[PDB]
Amino acid sequence: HFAADCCTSYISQSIPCSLMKSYFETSSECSKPGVIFLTKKGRQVCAKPSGPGVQDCMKKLKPYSI
């Protein structure tokens, strides 16, 4: 029961990938895209589309080594 999410601002420091269980990209329909990581502790972080290390965090969040 939700809709497309969007980031209003990116974090001010490196992304906390050491505590995120998954990650998701917003919809291009928003005036500004962005990928938010979902933390297992029940939280959300806002990051750019190609943030330095942000893509590495989402890469490790996807088990596909086979």
CA 51 vs. chain centroid, Å, equals 10
Q: Residue 62, exposed/middle/buried by CB under 10 A (0-12, 13-18, 19+)?
A: exposed
Q: How was this structure determined?
A: NMR
For residue 45, the number of C-alpha atoms closer than 13 Å in the C-beta half-sphere is 25
Separation in Å, CA 50 to CA 2, 25, 66:
25, 11, 25
- Dist. CA 54–CA 15, nearest whole Å: 7
Enclosing domain of residue 14: 1-66
- Asked if residues 20 and 61 have their Cβ atoms less than 8 Å apart, the reply is yes
Residue 36: its H or E element: strand 35-39
Report the CATH number at residue 18. Answer: 2.40.50.40
| Number of structural domains found in the chain | 1
C-alpha–C-alpha distance, residues 35 and 2, integer Å: 17
